Amino acid sequence: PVNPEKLLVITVATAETEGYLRFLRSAEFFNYTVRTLGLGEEWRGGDVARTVGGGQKVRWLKKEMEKYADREDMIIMFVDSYDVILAGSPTELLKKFVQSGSRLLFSAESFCWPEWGLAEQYPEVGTGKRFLNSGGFIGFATTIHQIVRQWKYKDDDDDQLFYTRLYLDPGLREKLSLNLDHKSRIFQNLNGALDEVVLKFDRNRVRIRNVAYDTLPIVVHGNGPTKLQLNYLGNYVPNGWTPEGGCGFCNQDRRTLPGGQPPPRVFLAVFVEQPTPFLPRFLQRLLLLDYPPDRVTLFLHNNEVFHEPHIADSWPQLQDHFSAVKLVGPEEALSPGEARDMAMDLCRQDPECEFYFSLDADAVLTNLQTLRILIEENRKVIAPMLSRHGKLWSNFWGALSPDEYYARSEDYVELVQRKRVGVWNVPYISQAYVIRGDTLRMELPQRDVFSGSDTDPDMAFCKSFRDKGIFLHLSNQHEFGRLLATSRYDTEHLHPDLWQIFDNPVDWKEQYIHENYSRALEGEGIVEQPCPDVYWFPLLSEQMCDELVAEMEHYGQWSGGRHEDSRLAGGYENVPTVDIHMKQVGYEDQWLQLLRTYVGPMTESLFPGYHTKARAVMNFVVRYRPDEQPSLRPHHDSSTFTLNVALNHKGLDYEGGGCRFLRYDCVISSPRKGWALLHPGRLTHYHEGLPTTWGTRYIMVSFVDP
Amino acid sequence: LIALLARNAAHALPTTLGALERLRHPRERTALWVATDHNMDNTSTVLREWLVAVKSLYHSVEWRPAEEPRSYPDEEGPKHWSDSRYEHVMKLRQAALKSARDMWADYILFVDADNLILNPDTLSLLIAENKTVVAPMLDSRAAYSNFWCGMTSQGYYKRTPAYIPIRKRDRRGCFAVPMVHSTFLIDLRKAASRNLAFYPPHPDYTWSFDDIIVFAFSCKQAEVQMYVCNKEEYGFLPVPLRAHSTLQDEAESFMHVQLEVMVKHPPAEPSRFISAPTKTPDKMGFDEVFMINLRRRQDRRERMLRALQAQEIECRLVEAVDGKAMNTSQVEALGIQMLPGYRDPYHGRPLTKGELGCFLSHYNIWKEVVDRGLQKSLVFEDDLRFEIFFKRRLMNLMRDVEREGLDWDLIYVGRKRMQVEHPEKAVPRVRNLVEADYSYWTLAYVISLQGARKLLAAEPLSKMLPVDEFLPVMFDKHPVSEYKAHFSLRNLHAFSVEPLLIYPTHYTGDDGYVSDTETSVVWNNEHVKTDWDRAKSQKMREQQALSREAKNSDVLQSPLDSAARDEL
C-alpha cells in the first residue's frame, strides 16, 4: 500500500527538444511528479551514443542527491528524457517494485556495450537478459546515495561501465541487494527485442505487451539505433489515437492567427522539373490561394526549356500579383539540389521569412485552405497528405529498411485511405511542407542539406533532419489534393496533354469535359428534345474544340471526297466526305475510351433498358466549306445511333444549317459549339444536311454499335 | 450443425466418425451437412453406410454426393492444390455456411475429414468460452497444429516468440491469434457473424488466393478476433504431406497418428456401425521378428502386439528369463560368470539380476539365430515408438544394403549415442548409414548370421556384461581399454542408421517410467536391491545434449521421412 506521493521523477535534459516535450506530455498524462535537472546547462559530454559519454548526468545527480541523503521513506527513480515515453500509472509501478522487493532494480539489456570481456563475470540468468544497462533504475534514496557517492571521474567519462564494475562486485551487490529485471517487468529496451513487443489496444488508452514473457512493461527506453521504432510507437501510447475518441494531442496548440495583424510572411517556392503535364492549370491555380498577395514571396525555378513558353505567358499575371517575384530560367544549368539549397539559404539569410513553404510542380491543391490550416498547426515541420487517384502511392513513408529505403509499415494502408485521422510522426515527407523559420535559423545553420552525397536530394534532406532530432509531422484530417502521374509524358505534339486521358482521367475531365455534363447526367434538365427521339446534351468544352481543330489542321491532310476508298475494306463509300479518320492521327484509342466512359451512361439513362459496350469502328471529323464540298444527300447511317458534335461557333466563324429530318419536317438551324446530337440512323430517321453559306465549319461524327 | 467435407478419407473415416459419434451432445439437437466430392476411393460408400445407419439419430441429414469426376483436369495429382480446387472448396464452405444460416442453426463446426476430435467434451468446452470464433488446439507429432500465431504481410507463416510457449502449453489460456484453420466453431447467433463469407473475397482482398488466408482476411475486416483455446488436450491431426505424396503415404500418416494416440491413451475405438478393412500382416521381408517381453508385463505386450498388427508386421513372440526370479543355483547351472572387476560406470555396482536376465535372453536369441541359420533377424524390446513410414523405410534401407552388398554385423537402428563429438564417417555408396560409435540404448538392432556366429564364438557367458557394455566392446568402440583387454575377438562390423526409427516410450524421469532392467537386485545376495535413484539416472534421453554441432549433413538421405507444410 505504498502512497503515490513518495515517488519523484528525476530527468536530465540540457535543452528543450520535441522529445522532451513528448516525455513531459506522457508523464503529465498520469499526473507524475517530475523534477528536471540540468535545464539550460551546457552538455559537457559529447556524442550521445556514438562511442562513449554520459559522464555529466552522474555528476548532476550526485549534486542533487545531497538534499535527499537521508530520506529513507522516499523512493526515487531516474531515467533518460529524450528517447523515453512512459506508459503506466504510478500505482502499478510501485506495486511491481514492491513485488520485486529488491533495493535497486536496473534495466537489463541484451548486449554488452562498453566492454565485451566482463561478460563471463555476470551471474547466469535462465531466459531473460543477463547484463546491466544504465538506462534507469528504481531504488531507495539511501541506496542510490551510497551507490553513486563513489563517483569521482571526469565529466567526459563513460557511464555504463562504472555501473557494471560496481555491480560486478559480489559482496557489495549482496549488501546493496542489486537486482536486474530480466523478464521485462518494468523496463523494456527496444534494442535487440524488436520482435518481442506488440501493441495492445484498449477503449481509451494504449499499452504494449511482451509476447515472449507475457508481461506489460511500464517504461520503454528505445535506446540505440531504434529512434525510428520508438518514434512510431509514440503515435499511440498512452493517448495518441484510440478508437473511442479520435486523436489526442492533435487538436490543441493552434495559433488561430489572432490580432488582425498582417499574417506571418510566407516565402513560397515552385520547382518545375521532370516536365509536368497540366502546367498552365497549376500556374493559374497559384493565384487563388487564400493568403494575401502582399505577404507572399514567389520563387519560380524552371528546369525545362519545353515549359518555357507556358511560364513566359503566365509571368505578367504573377508579376502583378505577388509583392516579390523572381525567376531562374533553364539556361542557368542548375541541378535541383542547388535550387532547393539556395532557396533555403535565401530565406535563411532573410529574417523576414517565418515559414519556408516548398511546393513541388506535381501537387494539385484542390483545397484552397491548405496554407491557413497548416500555418494554424504551428508544427516544426509538417506536410499535407496527397495520394495518387485509386492507388497506394502517397507522399510519405511508413518505415525505413536497413538500406535506408522504402519498406512497408503496418498502418500505411490505413493512413492512405483515411481510416485514421490526426497528425502523425513520420520518417520521410516530400512534395509539400511547411518549415518553421527558427528551425532554419538556429537549428539547421549548415548549408549543404540537399547536396553533398550520391543520395537523392530529398532523401538527403530528410536524413539531415532526422539526425538533428527534428520531428517530421504529417496531417490528413481534411482532404488536400492528389499527385499527378509523370511516369511517361511524351512531348512530340502541339498539345501533348491531350494524350493524358489514361494517366490522369480526373484532371483530364476537369480541363476538357464541358462543365455542364455532370449536372445534365444526374438529371436536372439541360438536355433538350427538339424533335421526337432526338436529344441535345452538352459534352465538350471550348478547349477540346480549339485544341482538336489545331491538331487536325496541323495534320492538314484532308483526304476523302472520292466515291471509292482504300480505308474502307469494301472500297465503295455510299457517300464520300472530305474527312480525317482518327486512325491516321493515332488518337483513335483515346476516342474509344472517351466514348466508353462519358457517352455510354448518357445514352443508357436517356433510353431506359438499353445496355451498351460503346464499340465504334468509323469515327472522323468532317469539314463543310462552300467551295470544297456541299452538304450530304439524304441517306441513312450504318449504326445503332450516331453521335454528332459541333467543333466551331456558328456565326462568328461560319453560317449554314444543321440536320433536316424528312419524315418529321424537322430543321436544326443553330448548332451549339459544345453540344452533341444523338439520334438513331438505321430505320426511323431520314436525315439530310443543310448547306453552309459563308465561313467554314467543322463537325465530329462517330458510328457506335454497328 | 456438425459439418464434414470428405475426399479420399476412407483410411481415416472409421476412427474419426466413431470419435464424432462419441461426442456427448444430444443427437436430436445436432444435425449433419456431410458432403463428399472428387473421391477416388470408396469414401462415398463408407459415408453413405454410416449416414444411413445414424440418420434416425440426428435431427436432419443433408447429403450432397458427387461421385464424378474423380480428379480435376488441372490437377497434377491427388495432393496437388490447384486454383480450381481451392475455388471449389471455397464454394463448398460457402454453401455449408449458407445451409447453416437457413436452418438458423446454433453455430457451425467445420470438422475436416482428417481431424481426429478425440475428446468427447470438445463441443461443450468450446461452447462455454462464449467466443465468436474459437478453435480447439489440435496436437500433432510435430510443432504443427491448427493455428498460426503470426503472419508477415503475404499471409505466410511468421515465427513468433509466442508459438513455442503456446505449443508446449506452458501458457494455458485463450489466445488472440491471426489465424485458425481446419477445426473451428463459428457462433452464428452473434450479430457480427452475419458479415463473414468465404466465397466472395473481400473487395479489398489483395493477398495470395488461398482458402485459409481469404477467410482470415474476412474475419479481420469484420473486426472478429479469432481466439484459440489450448486449455485442454482436445485431439490429434495428421501433418500435411508433400504434393507428390501418394494416398498410401497419407494412410500411413494417419495410421501413425493412431499409433501416437495409442502411446498415451486407450485406442480410439471405431464406430460399431462401420466396418473395418482387413489387414494382411507380413514380416516386411525379414526372416524373423523377435519380441522380448517380461512375463509379468502384459499392458506393454498387448500395446506392442496391437501396434505391430497396425503396421501389418508379423512377429514371433520370444519369452525371457526373469533374472530377478532366478536363484544362484540356476545361474550356476547355466555357467554364468561375471566379468572380473566389472563395476557399473555410473553407480558402483557389479550388476543386477535384471541385466543378467536380459543378457541371457539375448544370448538365447543369438543361439536360436545360429541354430536356425537365420540370415537376418529383428529383435525388439517392448517400449518402442514408430517413426513415420517405419516399415517401408526400413525395408528400403535393408534392400539397398543387400543389393549393394555389405559385410555389416550390427547396423544400429535405434540407440543413444554416448560419444557426442565430431560426426561419424558415412559409409560410401550406402545411403543413410554411418559407422557406429560408442552407443547406449541397444533397444533394437538387426544382426546377420556372421555377427551372431562371431558373438557366440566370443564365449560371452564367461565374461558377462550388460548388452550395452558388451556391444561397444565387440565393435572395438568401448572407451575403456581394460574391458577390451579382457576380450580377444573384436571383429564386429558395426554401423548405424542416421535417422533412427525407434525411441523409448518413456525416458528416465517421465511419468509412468518403470525399468524392469534397472530396478533389479544385485546378481549375488538378496538384500542388495537397487531402487531407481532419480538423481543418478543420467542417460534419460541422449537428445537434449545433441542440439550441438554434430553436423551429420553428409549422410545420403532417403526421399522418405519428408513431411510438414508451411507451419513448421
Binding site: 521504432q229 512510431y232 509499415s409 503496418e410 | 452473434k190 472478429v224
Partner: peptide, 19 residues
C-alpha cells in the same frame, strides 16, 4: 513491419429471437 498490432473489438450484441 515493426510492432504487430492487436486491434480488438468488443463482441456484437446477441441477435433477436425468431418467430
Amino acid at each position: 513491419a515493426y510492432f504487430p498490432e492487436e486491434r480488438w473489438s468488443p463482441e456484437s450484441p446477441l441477435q433477436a429471437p425468431r418467430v
